[PDB]
Structure 1
Amino acid sequence: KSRLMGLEALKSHIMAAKAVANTMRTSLGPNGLDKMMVDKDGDVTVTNDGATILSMMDVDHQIAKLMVELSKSQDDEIGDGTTGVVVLAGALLEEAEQLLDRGIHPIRIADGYEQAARVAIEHLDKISDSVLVDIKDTEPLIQTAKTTLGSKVVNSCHRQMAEIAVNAVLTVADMERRDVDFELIKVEGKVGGRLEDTKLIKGVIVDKDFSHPQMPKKVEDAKIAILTCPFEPPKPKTKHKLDVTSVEDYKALQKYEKEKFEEMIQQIKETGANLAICQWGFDDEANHLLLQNNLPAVRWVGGPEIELIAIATGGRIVPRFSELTAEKLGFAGLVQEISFGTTKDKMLVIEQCKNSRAVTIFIRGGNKMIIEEAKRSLHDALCVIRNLIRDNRVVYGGGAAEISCALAVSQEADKCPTLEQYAMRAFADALEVIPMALSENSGMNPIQTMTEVRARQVKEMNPALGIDCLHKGTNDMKQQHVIETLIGKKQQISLATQMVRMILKIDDIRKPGESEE
């Protein structure tokens, strides 16, 4: 048993609270600098937000450990603001240190932080607009759909994913009653075309099994016939011996395929489509011979995928070929083989207007590195509109809001006073750091920047202006088109305040001898 002083721990707390908070401070936004991950494998990786780098970074102190825990939630709901809470945590916390170094209870001021949260939250609740709407949000989408695709993989903002990503949301947004999930929409990374090659699908796209193109490539109807079972003679995606007794019996063998093509074709068709995903992969022969005979079937399929298309259709899979049902086939408002990539076979596009609980954006990329970085890019703008569709409210922030919410709380300190007064004072300065800390990452004096809008905040409060996160000569928010769902910042307000509280949790600083051991 080795018990240390909470102070000493508070050191190890604050000693952990720095580099992670620091990590963002020159990494904040595009004016921030990239975050490199080199692995236990020694693998160089350029990383982003907190949670990307935070999980990749191997957490050591309880804070570091607690970081990723807290940090995930902001990217979950909001998609953005993950980088901020870690900055915000230490910023206030490392003064809370200094405050406790004044001989101040963590006890007493942290309430004031919890309490100044709300009044900044409420000050936040003043900021910007309470509303976005289906056509409205699109431009604020386009705003963020700029900066989200104007950030990671390209800064170009292809309006492709910019308005493809929102549509999947906009498609599943209303579906969930003003809600969405990112299974319910999906980023489909598959290459074969560049970033500029993307798609939005109402369902699954799979590269359609063909054992020969001349044996007809046929897609039709709107419907897929979903089968765990054969549409052409089965096989468990493994080796199988095909033998015949005499020279002639090889010909009768294909008849069996040929008949059980149509026998399954005629069986599975009447129950809908002709297109039957067959989890069973087959030898070259019957596949193309059915492609020949009629109505291609999809073979060599992921058990998840026959399941994925089913749950996408909201109906089932047909498990048994002796069995069959229409619900156990596909509900799809379109099924079409469509040329997939520039490099490979036509994908089978199942876009489900019969039943789709999931509407998936598809992305090609010229590399995995870029198609993943775009895959990495999207979820953010995907998640911010997830906030929007539930609450369409956004806040101009990043140098408008921090110093704004800090100013009232700076004033609230003097209204409130005692333990909350140096809470709400220190509560505020942490906010004002982030826009400051952007000119940190940016090329500008972080002080005089914060000073700048500090003058502007004295001038005007909750401005459509702000700092320059894009480092434009104009320091704006509206015309920076920087903004966040007022969900997010508030949600982002919660977390560090949550965590700087969580370091206070109850009492116990004793261990068995094992705390980090």
Structure 2
Amino acid sequence: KDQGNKKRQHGLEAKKSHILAARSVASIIKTSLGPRGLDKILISPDGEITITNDGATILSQMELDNEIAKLLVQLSKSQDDEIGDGTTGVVVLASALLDQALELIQKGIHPIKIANGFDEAAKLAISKLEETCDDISASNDELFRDFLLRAAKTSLGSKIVSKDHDRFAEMAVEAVINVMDKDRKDVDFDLIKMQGRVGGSISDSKLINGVILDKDFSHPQMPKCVLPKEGSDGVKLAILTCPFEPPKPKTKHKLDISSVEEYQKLQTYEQDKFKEMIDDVKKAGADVVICQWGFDDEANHLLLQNDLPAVRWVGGQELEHIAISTNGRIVPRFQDLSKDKLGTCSRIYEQEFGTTKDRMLIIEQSKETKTVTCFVRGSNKMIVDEAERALHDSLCVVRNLVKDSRVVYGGGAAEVTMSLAVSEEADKQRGIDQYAFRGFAQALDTIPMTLAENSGLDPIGTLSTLKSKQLKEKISNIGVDCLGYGSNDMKELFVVDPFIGKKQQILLATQLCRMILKIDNVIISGKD
């Protein structure tokens, strides 16, 4: 169906069109590689206008009608949900591998042989990189923390967060540590939530081991802080899912007022009912009352008289988060409150940020919790978004470092070492596979060349100097001085990136190159 305007390609034409599309995609993010990447002005098809140098955002907002390019875009999007920091590098490496595959095909090598050779070369490069890794945790825990903080600050310094990058890195490290098991070393990003508001500056960012709920404790005169009572059993929080309203007959579920006398009598009876409910709450030992619905004026007044803060309009998921953080239980009604179900938190208090009318509250916990919120402040929505992205990058870096103590040095030094090893293997290797290995090494060489080009250095001279230094003099970690440094040899500059991150980048690039290479025909249906 829809034969009219149906796209089709031939083998000799498709094998070149795919590579041309790959090059076109690679040109999108070539300038964004490295800390010295260029900011691009993008307007999404939905009308979202922003300025950023992040490859992930560039590819997400930039859509296209080329199916081959859509493969790269989808791969980048999928990677963004994992680490996200190697998107530009992965795309560049995949483009280089595709160009090398095109060159091999022009020489008469079947695509399947090229894919197999690239897979073997990637395996060898990963093995060499692992062999050249340095174990930081097994050497010194203090150096491990220092490297974590240093990498976090290096990642943060490329964004607006540079103002409070120290606090941001501390918050990221603490958040990663709090939501992970030391032995298991598995970290779920779902355990760390991102929140923020427009206004103020990033200096007000705070790390919370619980939920905020963005509530003002109902009446403005309620206590703004509940202490643990000098080492008592924490602070008891009542979790409720019903409004604080007086019981009414089931016949009508409404109360009728005829005149002033009935008004006053009904008000007195409602006040008595509210007093009974508040006494029931107090007997349970609860200090702060949380309800899924709102509170009546009499309820708020009497709670103020009893100094019992009231939290109103809390969603079911928010109540579940409160229970998880405080290890409590959800109590249906006020009369069902009991000391065995009230949650136990370190403290609950109101935190004010500038003149924001939200007047949000903070619930803190001392033990490990499955809900951690990173609150971010900023004078503009774009500033808050950039700060949240920087926090995400720092969290990913810390997660990768804790997952595997083995780390690698950035600036392309690992790429240069892998390229040298692959070239040596290709020289040793016999058969057609030698060309594939050499092409893989040349593709690996692209990353340092691109970094040198983006940093304002002569790429031809820079790549050759790095390779010569790492080959003839000694094996070390020498990369592209993208940032202001007094010398090369990042080993002394302490530019470190996770080993598993680089391994994942290489694997994703190889898989994407194989995926694009193993597709020979493209069919696009027409439009009505």
Residue deviations 1:143-178 (CA, integer Å, cap 9, x gap): 121122111233345211111110111122336832
Residue deviations 1:109-162 (CA, integer Å, cap 9, x gap): 211111111111011112341233754332112212112211123334521111
Mapped contact 1:79–1:384 kept (Cα < 8 A): no
2:197 corresponds in structure 1 to 190
Mapped contact 1:333–1:355 kept (Cα < 8 A): no
What is the alpha-carbon distance in structure 1 between the residues aligned to residue 30 and residue 522 of structure 2? 33
What is the alpha-carbon distance in structure 2 between the residues aligned to residue 176 and residue 287 of structure 1? 48
Instruction: Name the CA shift for 1:250/1:369 in 2 (closer, same or farther; >3 Å).
Output: farther
What is the alpha-carbon distance in structure 2 between the residues aligned to residue 276 and residue 339 of structure 1? 20
Q: Summarize the alignment of residues 45-444 of structure 1 with structure 2, pairs less than 5 Å apart.
A: 45-132=50-137, 135-156=142-163, 158-174=165-181, 177-217=184-224, 219-221=226-228, 222-230=235-243, 244-252=257-265, 255=268, 258-282=271-295, 286-287=299-300, 290-321=303-334, 323-324=336-337, 329-344=342-357, 346-353=359-366, 356-444=369-457
1:514 corresponds in structure 2 to 525
Q: Summarize the alignment of residues 459-470 of structure 1 with structure 2, pairs less than 5 Å apart.
A: 459-460=472-473, 463-470=476-483
Mapped contact 1:468–1:480 kept (Cα < 8 A): no
Normalising by structure 1, we get a TM-score of 0.88
What is the alpha-carbon distance in structure 2 between the residues aligned to residue 27 and residue 73 of structure 1? 19
Residue deviations 1:263-322 (CA, integer Å, cap 9, x gap): 343334444532122121346664355334431111123333223323444544334445
Q: Could you tell me how far 1:79 is from its partner in structure 2? A: 4.2
- The one-letter code of the counterpart of 1:27 is S
Instruction: Name the CA shift for 1:218/1:475 in 2 (closer, same or farther; >3 Å).
Output: closer
- The one-letter code of the counterpart of 2:507 is S
- The one-letter code of the counterpart of 2:511 is Q
Instruction: Name the CA shift for 1:261/1:297 in 2 (closer, same or farther; >3 Å).
Output: farther
Instruction: Name the CA shift for 1:377/1:215 in 2 (closer, same or farther; >3 Å).
Output: closer
Residue deviations 1:202-227 (CA, integer Å, cap 9, x gap): 11123333444235545344332222
Q: Could you tell me how far 1:487 is from its partner in structure 2? A: 0.3
**Range that drifts further, 123-132 or 396-405:** 123-132
Asked whether 1:452 is paired with 2:445, we answer no
Instruction: Name the CA shift for 1:365/1:283 in 2 (closer, same or farther; >3 Å).
Output: farther
Q: Could you tell me how far 1:252 is from its partner in structure 2? A: 4.9
1:237 corresponds in structure 2 to none
What is the alpha-carbon distance in structure 1 between the residues aligned to residue 424 and residue 256 of structure 2? 88
**Range that drifts further, 45-54 or 194-203:** 45-54
What is the alpha-carbon distance in structure 2 between the residues aligned to residue 212 and residue 431 of structure 1? 63
What is the alpha-carbon distance in structure 2 between the residues aligned to residue 342 and residue 134 of structure 1? 42
Mapped contact 1:398–1:466 kept (Cα < 8 A): yes
Q: Could you tell me how far 1:480 is from its partner in structure 2? A: 4.2
- The one-letter code of the counterpart of 2:95 is G
- The one-letter code of the counterpart of 1:228 is T
What is the alpha-carbon distance in structure 1 between the residues aligned to residue 367 and residue 340 of structure 2? 11
Mapped contact 1:85–1:492 kept (Cα < 8 A): yes
> What's the secondary structure of 1:45's corresponding residue?
strand
Asked whether 1:43 is paired with 2:55, we answer no
Normalising by structure 2, we get a TM-score of 0.87
2:250 corresponds in structure 1 to none
RMSD: 3.1
What is the alpha-carbon distance in structure 1 between the residues aligned to residue 522 and residue 23 of structure 2? 24
What is the alpha-carbon distance in structure 1 between the residues aligned to residue 520 and residue 487 of structure 2? 51
Mapped contact 1:217–1:295 kept (Cα < 8 A): no
> What's the secondary structure of 2:349's corresponding residue?
strand
| Number of equivalent positions | 510
Mapped contact 2:408–2:499 kept (Cα < 8 A): yes
> What's the secondary structure of 1:159's corresponding residue?
helix
> What's the secondary structure of 1:339's corresponding residue?
coil
Q: Could you tell me how far 1:374 is from its partner in structure 2? A: 0.8
What is the alpha-carbon distance in structure 2 between the residues aligned to residue 60 and residue 34 of structure 1? 24
Q: Could you tell me how far 1:257 is from its partner in structure 2? A: 5.6
- The one-letter code of the counterpart of 2:495 is V
> What's the secondary structure of 2:160's corresponding residue?
coil
* Identity across matched positions, percent: 60
What is the alpha-carbon distance in structure 1 between the residues aligned to residue 44 and residue 302 of structure 2? 49
What is the alpha-carbon distance in structure 2 between the residues aligned to residue 361 and residue 296 of structure 1? 24
Residue deviations 1:18-56 (CA, integer Å, cap 9, x gap): 233222221113311013320224332123433322221
2:30 corresponds in structure 1 to 25
Larger-Rg structure: 2
Q: Could you tell me how far 1:251 is from its partner in structure 2? A: 4.6
**Range that drifts further, 346-355 or 160-169:** 346-355
What is the alpha-carbon distance in structure 1 between the residues aligned to residue 243 and residue 362 of structure 2? 20
Residue deviations 1:390-412 (CA, integer Å, cap 9, x gap): 21221002221111111110111
